Amino acid sequence: GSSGSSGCSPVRERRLEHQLEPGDTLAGLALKYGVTMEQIKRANRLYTNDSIFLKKTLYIPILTEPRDLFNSGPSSG
């Protein structure tokens, strides 16, 4: 009766560093990935008196499901 500690906790939601450009629009990024402007903002409380451009880089919340035609596994590049 050998019992060990098995069971990892994989992440669900992550953030991607996007080199915000001077010619980018909130509505653009939202769709560009698959989210809603609000989400992104509320996610990084970007809501400020002045345009968001004030910043330099904005992170994007990646929403993916455990449902995939084929899963590679723990294998990493």
PDB file of C-alpha atoms in Angstrom:
ATOM      1  CA  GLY A   1       0.000   0.000   0.000  1.00  0.00           C
ATOM      2  CA  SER A   2       2.242   2.780  -1.285  1.00  0.00           C
ATOM      3  CA  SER A   3       0.659   6.235  -1.140  1.00  0.00           C
ATOM      4  CA  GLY A   4       2.356   9.364  -2.448  1.00  0.00           C
ATOM      5  CA  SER A   5       1.555  13.033  -3.001  1.00  0.00           C
ATOM      6  CA  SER A   6       0.032  13.151  -6.486  1.00  0.00           C
ATOM      7  CA  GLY A   7      -2.089  15.966  -7.883  1.00  0.00           C
ATOM      8  CA  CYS A   8      -0.883  19.215  -9.432  1.00  0.00           C
ATOM      9  CA  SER A   9      -2.828  22.471  -9.731  1.00  0.00           C
ATOM     10  CA  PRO A  10      -2.698  23.794 -13.320  1.00  0.00           C
ATOM     11  CA  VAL A  11      -3.557  27.424 -14.064  1.00  0.00           C
ATOM     12  CA  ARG A  12      -6.724  28.443 -15.906  1.00  0.00           C
ATOM     13  CA  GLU A  13      -6.455  32.177 -16.584  1.00  0.00           C
ATOM     14  CA  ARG A  14      -3.188  33.837 -17.605  1.00  0.00           C
ATOM     15  CA  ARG A  15      -1.956  37.213 -18.850  1.00  0.00           C
ATOM     16  CA  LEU A  16      -0.016  37.952 -22.038  1.00  0.00           C
ATOM     17  CA  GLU A  17       2.331  40.933 -22.312  1.00  0.00           C
ATOM     18  CA  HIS A  18       1.267  42.929 -25.371  1.00  0.00           C
ATOM     19  CA  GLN A  19       3.479  45.758 -26.622  1.00  0.00           C
ATOM     20  CA  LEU A  20       0.654  48.305 -26.689  1.00  0.00           C
ATOM     21  CA  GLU A  21       1.028  50.479 -29.788  1.00  0.00           C
ATOM     22  CA  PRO A  22      -0.012  54.096 -30.489  1.00  0.00           C
ATOM     23  CA  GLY A  23      -2.277  52.819 -33.248  1.00  0.00           C
ATOM     24  CA  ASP A  24      -4.154  50.249 -31.179  1.00  0.00           C
ATOM     25  CA  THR A  25      -7.720  50.467 -29.874  1.00  0.00           C
ATOM     26  CA  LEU A  26      -9.293  48.847 -26.813  1.00  0.00           C
ATOM     27  CA  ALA A  27     -12.114  47.404 -28.917  1.00  0.00           C
ATOM     28  CA  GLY A  28      -9.455  46.001 -31.227  1.00  0.00           C
ATOM     29  CA  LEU A  29      -7.476  44.056 -28.636  1.00  0.00           C
ATOM     30  CA  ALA A  30     -10.662  42.723 -27.042  1.00  0.00           C
ATOM     31  CA  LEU A  31     -11.673  40.865 -30.204  1.00  0.00           C
ATOM     32  CA  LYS A  32      -8.099  40.376 -31.411  1.00  0.00           C
ATOM     33  CA  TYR A  33      -8.001  37.721 -28.689  1.00  0.00           C
ATOM     34  CA  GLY A  34     -11.533  36.852 -27.621  1.00  0.00           C
ATOM     35  CA  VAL A  35     -12.602  39.043 -24.711  1.00  0.00           C
ATOM     36  CA  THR A  36     -14.486  42.264 -23.982  1.00  0.00           C
ATOM     37  CA  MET A  37     -12.893  45.688 -23.533  1.00  0.00           C
ATOM     38  CA  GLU A  38     -14.439  45.947 -20.068  1.00  0.00           C
ATOM     39  CA  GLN A  39     -12.822  42.692 -18.947  1.00  0.00           C
ATOM     40  CA  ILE A  40      -9.338  43.826 -19.963  1.00  0.00           C
ATOM     41  CA  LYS A  41      -9.841  47.165 -18.212  1.00  0.00           C
ATOM     42  CA  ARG A  42     -11.495  45.895 -15.031  1.00  0.00           C
ATOM     43  CA  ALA A  43      -8.805  43.206 -15.120  1.00  0.00           C
ATOM     44  CA  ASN A  44      -6.066  45.838 -14.922  1.00  0.00           C
ATOM     45  CA  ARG A  45      -8.142  48.735 -13.595  1.00  0.00           C
ATOM     46  CA  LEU A  46      -6.864  50.692 -16.597  1.00  0.00           C
ATOM     47  CA  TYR A  47      -9.853  52.998 -16.136  1.00  0.00           C
ATOM     48  CA  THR A  48      -8.181  56.388 -15.715  1.00  0.00           C
ATOM     49  CA  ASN A  49      -9.094  60.049 -16.185  1.00  0.00           C
ATOM     50  CA  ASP A  50      -6.878  60.072 -19.277  1.00  0.00           C
ATOM     51  CA  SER A  51      -6.827  57.604 -22.172  1.00  0.00           C
ATOM     52  CA  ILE A  52      -5.251  54.210 -21.502  1.00  0.00           C
ATOM     53  CA  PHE A  53      -2.430  55.038 -23.916  1.00  0.00           C
ATOM     54  CA  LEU A  54      -0.884  56.601 -20.812  1.00  0.00           C
ATOM     55  CA  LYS A  55       0.617  53.171 -20.142  1.00  0.00           C
ATOM     56  CA  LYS A  56       3.204  51.330 -22.237  1.00  0.00           C
ATOM     57  CA  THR A  57       2.267  47.645 -22.129  1.00  0.00           C
ATOM     58  CA  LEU A  58      -1.095  45.998 -21.457  1.00  0.00           C
ATOM     59  CA  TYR A  59      -1.685  42.389 -20.412  1.00  0.00           C
ATOM     60  CA  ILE A  60      -4.393  40.252 -22.011  1.00  0.00           C
ATOM     61  CA  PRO A  61      -6.341  37.595 -20.065  1.00  0.00           C
ATOM     62  CA  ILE A  62      -6.186  34.256 -21.881  1.00  0.00           C
ATOM     63  CA  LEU A  63      -9.381  32.245 -21.424  1.00  0.00           C
ATOM     64  CA  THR A  64      -8.954  28.626 -22.514  1.00  0.00           C
ATOM     65  CA  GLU A  65     -10.933  25.473 -21.736  1.00  0.00           C
ATOM     66  CA  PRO A  66      -9.651  21.965 -20.902  1.00  0.00           C
ATOM     67  CA  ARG A  67     -11.405  20.807 -24.072  1.00  0.00           C
ATOM     68  CA  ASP A  68      -8.892  20.280 -26.878  1.00  0.00           C
ATOM     69  CA  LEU A  69      -8.981  18.021 -29.938  1.00  0.00           C
ATOM     70  CA  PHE A  70      -5.596  16.748 -28.757  1.00  0.00           C
ATOM     71  CA  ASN A  71      -3.573  17.481 -25.621  1.00  0.00           C
ATOM     72  CA  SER A  72       0.225  17.391 -25.825  1.00  0.00           C
ATOM     73  CA  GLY A  73       0.712  16.829 -22.107  1.00  0.00           C
ATOM     74  CA  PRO A  74       3.398  17.873 -19.599  1.00  0.00           C
ATOM     75  CA  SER A  75       5.858  18.043 -22.496  1.00  0.00           C
ATOM     76  CA  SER A  76       7.323  21.542 -22.780  1.00  0.00           C
ATOM     77  CA  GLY A  77       9.348  23.230 -25.506  1.00  0.00           C
TER      78      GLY A  77
END
